[PDB]
Each structure stands twice: as structure tokens, then as C-alpha cells.
Design goal:
about 270 residues; alpha+beta; binds cytidine-5'-triphosphate; binds bromide ion; binds magnesium ion
């Protein structure tokens, strides 16, 4: 009689319905999927990721329909600066603390093509890492769903490679951690607790997401697998060709997580 995901999806569609159309749309994060370790009563932001055809024109059209989605700085940023500066290295731009119906929304915009390239090749890891956690689908298609699956499969290969103990919960934690290693906006103390608080409260969703019995098999709480990383996304595979170990894979990923979270936090003031 109550399906959380139908009720959230409807509310989010209301928000999007005042905004220029998108190719696909997804909810994620603590405003969409519960997390342990929040004090009740904390009203976290509803985090969304929207895929568009043309970054410049989606924003231009939304600056006329919803000008209050943007600071003064930010409108000039989106209308004046080069597309290369706007996309930056992650390809995604964030509007935060957007108020709608007693809630706060924070959405990111990414062009279709940058989404495809990043998901397939991991030349950037910022967005593909977020798609390794629970995703509420609002609007998608077969092709994008298959991108999402391959990205999880390759995350799972990397997870199995890094794992020391053959324990299921720790595979889920290792996977969920890939995009958090090296993140510059997470205080040191809370970094391990954030990952635990996500997996702890969405264990079911993780069960569905990483249900790949050709890579590893579940026996209660432990798993059996043989390491297989022979096909990985092209930029990480290129990076590791002479040193295919867990250490070099984590080197690549956390280097990207450090550089990208830092650039993403700078771009965020230029666009509020
Ligand atoms: N380095 C990071 C940071 C975040 N994410 C994912 O993307 C969402 C990021 O939303 P964010 O608002 O940063 O984290 P929240 O979990 O929503 O915490 P908060 O209440 O502070 O918004 C997270 O849920 C997490 O799954 C990630 O995978 N890698
Ligand atoms: Br568009
Ligand atoms: Br960037
Ligand atoms: Mg959030």
C-alpha cells in the first residue's frame, strides 16, 4: 500500500516538470535512499543527476523559466564561459539549495556524450562512482540501463580484486568505497562511517545491484570467486597495463577522486 520509490519518483517528477526536458533523470544519495547515522529531523537535500543533449542550451532555457535556480555569478557563468570551462573535468554542473515545496533539491547536469564516455572508459570517475550506489530511476532507456549495469560489473571486478577476506558485506563496502578513496570534501573521521552507513541501510539494494554470479558466488555471508579483471574500462586498463595489481588500481581511482572532488568544489561556487 506504500512503495517509497513510487512516492519519491512522483515528487521528483513534479520538480522536473517545471524545468526543460531531459534525456534521463535519476535520484540518489541520502535524500532518496535512507542512511544510518543521521539524527532524525535533519532534512538532507534531494540529490538528482540529469542527462541532457546540450548543456549550454538546457541551462539557457532554464535561466529564463526558473531564474532563481541560479546566483548572479552563475547565470553569467553559464551564458558567457566556454563549454570547456563549464564541463570541466567531470562533465557535470551542480545547482544546490534549490527550494521546492518545503524541500531542498540539488541537481547535476551532464551531457549525454560525456556520460557515455565516462561510464565506459572511466577517464573520469566522478559520475560513474555515484552510479555504483543505489539509483532511483526516474526516466531512462535500455541503452543507459546497460551502461549502468556494465559500470557496476566493472566496479564489482575491482571490488573482488581488492578484497582481502572473502566476506560479502566487505565486498559491498569495498565497492561503495571506490569513489570515496581520496575524496577531498569528506572529513577524515567520517569517511569510513559514510560508507558503512550507506551499505548498512541499503543492503537489499546492493544485493540486487551486484548480483553477478559469473564473477563471484554467494554462500550466506561469504563468497567464492577467482579474480578476473581481464576486461576493464579503457583508461584504467591503459593505466595498469604494466602493473595489474590492487595498489595501482587504487592509485588511479583515488588520484582521480582527489583531483575531481577538488575541481568540483571550486566549480560549485562559480555556479552555486
Ligand atoms: N565521493 C563520493 C561522494 C558521494 N557519492 C555518492 O553520491 C551521493 C552523494 O551525495 P552527497 O550529498 O555528497 O552525500 P549524501 O550521502 O547525500 O550526504 P549529505 O546529507 O551530506 O548530502 C552519496 O549518497 C554517495 O552514494 C559517491 O559515490 N562518491
Ligand atoms: Br538538452
Ligand atoms: Br569539473
Ligand atoms: Mg546529498
Amino acid at each position: 500500500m506504500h512503495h517509497h520509490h513510487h512516492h519519491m519518483k512522483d515528487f521528483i517528477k513534479e520538480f522536473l516538470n517545471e524545468r526543460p526536458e531531459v534525456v534521463a533523470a535519476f535520484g540518489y544519495g541520502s535524500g532518496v535512499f535512507k542512511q544510518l547515522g543521521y539524527d532524525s529531523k535533519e532534512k538532507p537535500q534531494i540529490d538528482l543527476i540529469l542527462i541532457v543533449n546540450d548543456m549550454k542550451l538546457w541551462h539557457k532555457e532554464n535561466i529564463k523559466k526558473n531564474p532563481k535556480d541560479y546566483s548572479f555569478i552563475g547565470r553569467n557563468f553559464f551564458l558567457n564561459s566556454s563549454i570547456d570551462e563549464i564541463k570541466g573535468i567531470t562533465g557535470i554542473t551542480y545547482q544546490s539549495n534549490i527550494e521546492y515545496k518545503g524541500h531542498l533539491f540539488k541537481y547535476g547536469i551532464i551531457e549525454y556524450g560525456d556520460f557515455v564516455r565516462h561510464m565506459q572508459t572511466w577517464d573520469s570517475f566522478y559520475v560513474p562512482g555515484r552510479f555504483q550506489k543505489p539509483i532511483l530511476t526516474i526516466k531512462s532507456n535500455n541503452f543507459i540501463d546497460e551502461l549502468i549495469l556494465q559500470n557496476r560489473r566493472n566496479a564489482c571486478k575491482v571490488g573482488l580484486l581488492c578484497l582481502n577476506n572473502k566476506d560479502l558485506k566487505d565486498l559491498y563496502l569495498t565497492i561503495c568505497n571506490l569513489s570515496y578513496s581520496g575524496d577531498t570534501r569528506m572529513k577524515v573521521a567520517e569517511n569510513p562511517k559514510k560508507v558503512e552507513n550507506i551499505v548498512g541501510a541499503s543492503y537489499d539494494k546492493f544485493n540486487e545491484m551486484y548480483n553477478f554470479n559469473d564473477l563471484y558466488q554467494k554462500n550466506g555471508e561469504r563468497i567464492e570467486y577467482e579474480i578476473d579483471i581481464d576486461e576493464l574500462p579503457s583508461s584504467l586498463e591503459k593505466y595498469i597495463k604494466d602493473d595489474k595489481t590492487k595498489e595501482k588500481v587504487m592509485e588511479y581511482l583515488s588520484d582521480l577522486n582527489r583531483k575531481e572532488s577538488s575541481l568540483q568544489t571550486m566549480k560549485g561556487i562559480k555556479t552555486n
